[PDB]
């Protein structure tokens, strides 16, 4: 694994964004 | 006429040309062995 966690943080924000668009709550 | 068939295997010739006793007898051949355990090969000779 390459060092760093800032990129992985903003990626989780992109993951949950896609999960929101895929299966949004009511 | 057709190449690839150069290697005509002969065990008595192999152990005479590239033999343990030959490389140890000649001073030049000694360099082949102790340069090899330096690398760490299992079969130091053939």
């Amino acid at each position: 694994v390459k060092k760093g966690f800032r990129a992985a943080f903003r990626f989780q924000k992109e993951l949950e964004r896609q999960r929101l668009l895929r299966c949004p709550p009511p | 006429k057709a190449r690839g068939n150069e290697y005509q295997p002969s065990n008595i010739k192999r152990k005479n040309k590239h033999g343990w006793v030959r490389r140890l007898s000649t001073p030049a051949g000694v360099q082949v062995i102790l340069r090899r355990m330096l690398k760490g090969r299992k079969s130091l000779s053939h």
Partner: protein, 97 residues
């Protein structure tokens, strides 16, 4: 892909330990310690650099002259090729001539 899907574990940063609390101490031993010692002999490191700066060439020539007799044959051989390639490089290659 280069990124990682899952996050890494949160690395705990101990800002108060033996090293960081006692960091920077005994650097001014000469200024207010009646100059009994210099701060250059304090640092722990190789013998070819204890309070001294040098480029790639300077550190190499200081190494072989000081500890080169103790260095390995392979490491010493790579050292001679290094300075020889870097001697000609700084002298012949580059701008400003």
């Amino acid at each position: 892909i280069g990124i990682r899907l899952t996050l890494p574990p949160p690395k705990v940063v101990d800002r108060w330990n033996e090293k960081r609390a006692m960091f920077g101490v005994y650097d001014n031993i000469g200024i207010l310690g009646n100059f009994e010692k210099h701060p250059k002999e304090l640092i722990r490191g190789p013998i070819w650099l204890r309070g001294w700066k040098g480029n790639e060439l300077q550190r190499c020539i200081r190494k072989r002259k000081m500890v080169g007799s103790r260095m390995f044959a392979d490491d010493l051989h790579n050292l001679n090729k290094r300075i020889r390639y870097l001697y000609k490089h700084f002298n012949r290659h580059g701008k400003f001539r």
